[PDB]
Design an enzyme around this catalytic site. Sequence first.
Site, PDB file in Angstrom:
ATOM      1  N   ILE A 163       4.079  -5.122  -4.727  1.00 60.20           N
ATOM      2  CA  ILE A 163       4.665  -3.895  -5.243  1.00 60.20           C
ATOM      3  C   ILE A 163       3.616  -2.824  -5.503  1.00 60.20           C
ATOM      4  O   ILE A 163       3.973  -1.636  -5.565  1.00 60.20           O
ATOM      5  CB  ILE A 163       5.482  -4.176  -6.520  1.00 60.20           C
ATOM      6  CG1 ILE A 163       6.500  -5.268  -6.234  1.00 60.20           C
ATOM      7  CG2 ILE A 163       6.233  -2.940  -6.994  1.00 60.20           C
ATOM      8  CD1 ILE A 163       6.636  -6.212  -7.356  1.00 60.20           C
ATOM      9  N   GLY A 164       2.337  -3.175  -5.597  1.00 58.70           N
ATOM     10  CA  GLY A 164       1.349  -2.126  -5.784  1.00 58.70           C
ATOM     11  C   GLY A 164      -0.037  -2.675  -6.043  1.00 58.70           C
ATOM     12  O   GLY A 164      -0.354  -3.804  -5.673  1.00 58.70           O
TER      13      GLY A 164
ATOM     14  N   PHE B 104      -4.986  -1.741  -9.768  1.00 56.52           N
ATOM     15  CA  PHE B 104      -6.106  -2.657  -9.826  1.00 56.52           C
ATOM     16  C   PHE B 104      -5.947  -3.709  -8.747  1.00 56.52           C
ATOM     17  O   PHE B 104      -6.030  -3.403  -7.576  1.00 56.52           O
ATOM     18  CB  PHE B 104      -6.110  -3.321 -11.171  1.00 56.52           C
ATOM     19  CG  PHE B 104      -7.466  -3.547 -11.732  1.00 56.52           C
ATOM     20  CD1 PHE B 104      -8.088  -2.563 -12.467  1.00 56.52           C
ATOM     21  CD2 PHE B 104      -8.096  -4.750 -11.560  1.00 56.52           C
ATOM     22  CE1 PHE B 104      -9.326  -2.769 -13.018  1.00 56.52           C
ATOM     23  CE2 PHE B 104      -9.330  -4.974 -12.110  1.00 56.52           C
ATOM     24  CZ  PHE B 104      -9.947  -3.982 -12.841  1.00 56.52           C
ATOM     25  N   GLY B 105      -5.742  -4.956  -9.134  1.00 57.00           N
ATOM     26  CA  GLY B 105      -5.543  -6.010  -8.162  1.00 57.00           C
ATOM     27  C   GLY B 105      -4.118  -5.894  -7.678  1.00 57.00           C
ATOM     28  O   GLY B 105      -3.260  -5.456  -8.414  1.00 57.00           O
ATOM     29  N   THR B 106      -3.858  -6.281  -6.442  1.00 62.41           N
ATOM     30  CA  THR B 106      -2.528  -6.171  -5.888  1.00 62.41           C
ATOM     31  C   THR B 106      -1.435  -6.807  -6.722  1.00 62.41           C
ATOM     32  O   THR B 106      -1.208  -7.994  -6.671  1.00 62.41           O
ATOM     33  CB  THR B 106      -2.495  -6.779  -4.489  1.00 62.41           C
ATOM     34  OG1 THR B 106      -2.093  -8.150  -4.559  1.00 62.41           O
ATOM     35  CG2 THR B 106      -3.856  -6.680  -3.842  1.00 62.41           C
ATOM     36  N   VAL B 107      -0.724  -5.989  -7.455  1.00 57.16           N
ATOM     37  CA  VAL B 107       0.357  -6.479  -8.304  1.00 57.16           C
ATOM     38  C   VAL B 107       1.551  -6.857  -7.434  1.00 57.16           C
ATOM     39  O   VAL B 107       1.992  -6.062  -6.585  1.00 57.16           O
ATOM     40  CB  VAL B 107       0.754  -5.438  -9.365  1.00 57.16           C
ATOM     41  CG1 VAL B 107       1.710  -6.051 -10.381  1.00 57.16           C
ATOM     42  CG2 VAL B 107      -0.486  -4.896 -10.059  1.00 57.16           C
TER      43      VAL B 107
ATOM     44  N   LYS C  23      -0.739  -9.806 -11.502  1.00 54.31           N
ATOM     45  CA  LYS C  23      -1.860  -9.053 -10.966  1.00 54.31           C
ATOM     46  C   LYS C  23      -2.872 -10.075 -10.473  1.00 54.31           C
ATOM     47  O   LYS C  23      -3.311 -10.947 -11.233  1.00 54.31           O
ATOM     48  CB  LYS C  23      -2.464  -8.120 -12.016  1.00 54.31           C
ATOM     49  CG  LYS C  23      -3.477  -7.142 -11.444  1.00 54.31           C
ATOM     50  CD  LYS C  23      -3.910  -6.108 -12.470  1.00 54.31           C
ATOM     51  CE  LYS C  23      -4.742  -6.729 -13.575  1.00 54.31           C
ATOM     52  NZ  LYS C  23      -4.983  -5.761 -14.681  1.00 54.31           N
TER      53      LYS C  23
ATOM     54  N   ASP D 258      -8.618   3.532 -20.267  1.00 55.22           N
ATOM     55  CA  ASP D 258      -7.897   4.011 -19.091  1.00 55.22           C
ATOM     56  C   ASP D 258      -6.445   4.335 -19.417  1.00 55.22           C
ATOM     57  O   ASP D 258      -5.543   4.079 -18.613  1.00 55.22           O
ATOM     58  CB  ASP D 258      -7.971   2.992 -17.955  1.00 55.22           C
ATOM     59  CG  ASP D 258      -7.633   3.597 -16.603  1.00 55.22           C
ATOM     60  OD1 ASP D 258      -7.589   4.842 -16.500  1.00 55.22           O
ATOM     61  OD2 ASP D 258      -7.401   2.825 -15.650  1.00 55.22           O
TER      62      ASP D 258
END
Lengths: 223, 230, 276, 278
Positions: free
Chosen positions: D16-17, D18-21, D33, D126
């Site tokens: 679905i999307g 830092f580390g590849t979530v 994640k 962040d």
Amino acid sequence: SMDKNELVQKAKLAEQAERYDDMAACMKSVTEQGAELSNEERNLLSVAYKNVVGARRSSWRVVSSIEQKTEGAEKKQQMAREYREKIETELRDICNDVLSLLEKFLIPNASQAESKVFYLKMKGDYYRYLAEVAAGDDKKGIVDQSQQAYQEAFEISKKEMQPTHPIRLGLALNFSVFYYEILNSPEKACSLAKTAFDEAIAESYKDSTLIMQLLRDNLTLWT
Amino acid sequence: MDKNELVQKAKLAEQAERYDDMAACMKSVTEQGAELSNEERNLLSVAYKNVVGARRSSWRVVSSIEQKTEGAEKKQQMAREYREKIETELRDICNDVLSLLEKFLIPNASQAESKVFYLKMKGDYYRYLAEVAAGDDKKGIVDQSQQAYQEAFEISKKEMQPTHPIRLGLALNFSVFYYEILNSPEKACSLAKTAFDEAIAELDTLSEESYKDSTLIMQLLRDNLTLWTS
Amino acid sequence: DWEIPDGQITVGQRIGSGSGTVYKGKWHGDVAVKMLNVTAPTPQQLQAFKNEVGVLRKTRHVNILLFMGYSTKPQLAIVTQWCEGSSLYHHLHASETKFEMKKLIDIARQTARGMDYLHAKSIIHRDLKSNNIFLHEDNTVKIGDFGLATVKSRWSGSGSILWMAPEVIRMQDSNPYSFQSDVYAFGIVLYELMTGQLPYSNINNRDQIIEMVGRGSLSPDLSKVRSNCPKRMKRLMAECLKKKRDERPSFPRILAEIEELARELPKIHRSASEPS
Amino acid sequence: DDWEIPDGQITVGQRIGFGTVYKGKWHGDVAVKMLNVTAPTPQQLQAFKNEVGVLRKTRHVNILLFMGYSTKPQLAIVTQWCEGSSLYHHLHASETKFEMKKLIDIARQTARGMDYLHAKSIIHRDLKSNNIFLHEDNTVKIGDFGLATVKSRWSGSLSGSILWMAPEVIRMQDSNPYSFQSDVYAFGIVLYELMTGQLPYSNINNRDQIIEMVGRGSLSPDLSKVRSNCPKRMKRLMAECLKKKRDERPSFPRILAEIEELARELPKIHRSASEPSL
């Protein structure tokens, strides 16, 4: 007793107040004015009378069911029956109003095919509603008039309308449940329903998703 | 015609959600003159509460539309006239219920339970009339509401335990009166918190069914107190 | 580790009782606080509280009431997330909130996820009931009240009796509680979800109920399940309610069955025409 | 073995999307994640164990709930699944029309989350609307703690999300530019996003310079683009949280207290609740 615009405003205001009897009266007056209704005016008349009659259909079903479960009690069943016939009278008067408006103004003034298939569908739906509570000696007649209007609209439906068009998807839905419920023809109703659903999947954006879901629920429960 | 036939057709109207029919049936039953049973009392209450609630909701909707319509003077005139139509219906319903209370119900109430229930119903319907009354008769209606509420409140605290569902509901409705009608949040939160804490103390002391009856109103009291202090 | 200093928690109105008494509090937002109203805890209450904190410190799941910390200074206290709303007992039997079958299925699925997680961490709740199930924002299920919970490590440490399994009620032996007793409590909460009422509705007394359920003469009346309740769900509850512990299913497959049945979505009880 | 999840228990689903979530199944839905590397380098393992250490200290309704970690196939952090897009998504990509009451509530929840965080001496470093997730468009959840830390004397070691970075963090001229205040400035920027509908420094032609001007102080958010119904207390509080010099900014207990106070003087939406029919 006011301008068509004044009645449409009072109809919209009754719609937001969820007073469907007032909106129905307003739209009845607007249609007795004689002019062709707009898409908005068409939709307001539909919502008004459909809610007005739906309340009565729901009450009729509840009170009929309660009629079934009378075991060993004359007066209880008598009271439930007389109440059922009171609701029956209101249901018939409402449907007769709607069918008189359909036959004397709506269908004759329909310029495009869309309007006249919609009004013939509403014609079939209200005959439907009357059919469900029909006694039996006049039942046949009401069912006959229902299917005549339904099918008459059906003939024009897949001749000028895209498979995605929600008005016919609904005409198909009501005609299929007409065959299944009103009459006893499961084969025909399921044939028509699956035909329409597959033609729609082959080829309003959110409206059709849910009407195809209603078709899939219908066929799922009929099979 | 029979009282039991009217009660049964009232229940049948309740099942079909035709609250006007149930209201008419219960009005006939109370006009017979006899003290109502607990079931008959609750059917009359439910019937007229639904009948008047439909009008209250519609009134709120069209009132909001009335105030939020600026430019169009003709549309705002129509919304005003429809608001007054709904208002007239509202008033007739409330006057019907208050007439039933004043003319039949209160005098035949032997027990304290009955008299707090009916005085609270009188306060509620005068409060519904207060929600729409404007200027001249407003003060009179508000005074009659507060007076009936206060008398019922006194009889509640003097012959009903804090967990009694009727007393808890009276507390809830009186607090809502203070908040919405008199616009005095502090007294409303005071009354609500007092009633809720006094009921919470004794809450363990109940039966499962008494617990369902009391908790249903105590959760509303705590929802109101959370919302008034937010 | 998770201890909250005294003075940081502003305790508000008293809301009720638990297994201690529960109040509302403010601590970096809203919190619930279960506290014991005693000057000096006895060694049994202090060990019980330490056990409950130990169990909750192992619970970390969306469908488990989120434990946030504990305090000792004024009084012993467990603090959790605040849940706006009511318990599932309140919704079902105190307001008779008309739930659609879809939301009932979703509530059952979330409860099953919570007890799958708990049993996967070898935690037995031993008091699972509709009153100990809270709805956050009338949307999310939160399993609460771990006062009678434990971890299963081959040792036994020790009014709401409708969820008690026959073995638990029978008291034949000292260690009745198990995963199957929790599964039977779960069966009872599905009974509540699918009927709308408590089981043993017509036998009014509370003492006989015990004798009848322990013997096996009485079981929930599955004929009061409403007609729109999927057949699978009724079958699953029957499996979770079976009188002998060893024929009851485990929570992984209870969850798998609710998940599979989750997806099936018959909105249509009867046929349905085109609406507005 | 305290929060570690054995391999095989987690079924990893769609990316679905830092580390590849990704989305995963583990006693229900979960978010995972995951770093897609066979063998973690010592910096990635230090970062990962630092993040797990931080997350095991977070236990709050407005913090994305850490649920466990895995190392067997690849290092992985697992949290609860939250149905719904990021606050950045709702504000600037779908332009979901939020009422001012809901915006105040979102700011209040974020403030609660960072009050909790700072009360456990956690600096996120962040905080941005992309790292704020909405749970059924009803609850706020602070997430992506890959850059978070416990404030320690020997605190060991931003990419392109520059607009939530405080000027001192851009300058890196200060001994410790990351601080409670830097997070407060990021929070000020998220309130700017909430009350404006836009990202800051919108009407600007040159882009690389903007860093230089905020670092110098030549550039600050244009508060005139705040919508007219935004409470004056909220605009003042954003101004307080965005002042150029770290020591004029407020602390999160005071931010939280003032956001909470404003919500009580907000008029009520619903009406009272009276005795329902039995």
